[PDB]
Amino acid sequence: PTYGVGHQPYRVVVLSFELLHAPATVCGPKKSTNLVKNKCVNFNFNGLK
Amino acid sequence: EFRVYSSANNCTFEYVSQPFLMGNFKNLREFVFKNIDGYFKIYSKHTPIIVREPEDLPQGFSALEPLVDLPIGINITRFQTLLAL
Numbered sequence A: 001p002t003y004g005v006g007h008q009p010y011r012v013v014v015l016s017f018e019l020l021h022a023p024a025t026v027c028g029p030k031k032s033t034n035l036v037k038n039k040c041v042n043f044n045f046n047g048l049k
Numbered sequence B: 001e002f003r004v005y006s007s008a009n010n011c012t013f014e015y016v017s018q019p020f021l022m023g024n025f026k027n028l029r030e031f032v033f034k035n036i037d038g039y040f041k042i043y044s045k046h047t048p049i050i051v052r053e054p055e056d057l058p059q060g061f062s063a064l065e066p067l068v069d070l071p072i073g074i075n076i077t078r079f080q081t082l083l084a085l
Helices: none
Strands: B026-036 B039-049 B065-071
Touching: none
Parallel strands: none
Antiparallel strands: B026 B039, B039 B065
């Protein structure tokens, strides 16, 4: 710690995510909103838009 | 009592679904195993069955409910059975 911030160790983590022919199992976040019925709404469910 | 193998390598998937595939009457457990577009599907159906005489599959319609949809994505051309003594 007697040195400056220039040459201090920065813990480095590299992410490698290559896509192949295997089925995907880990995805990104899925946002959601509150439901209000008895009116014509654009539904955007998992596979039924 | 893990007499199935002798070495354990780098595994890519592991699941321990606690609910598992489960007086004079016996039970019949039907399963359907398939693998399509990478996903490995397993359907199960449990039904009590009374003993007849030539011990064959009973006559009747009983659909199998979808149970597991494990995403594996491997080539499966051979299979075996693990029974307990």
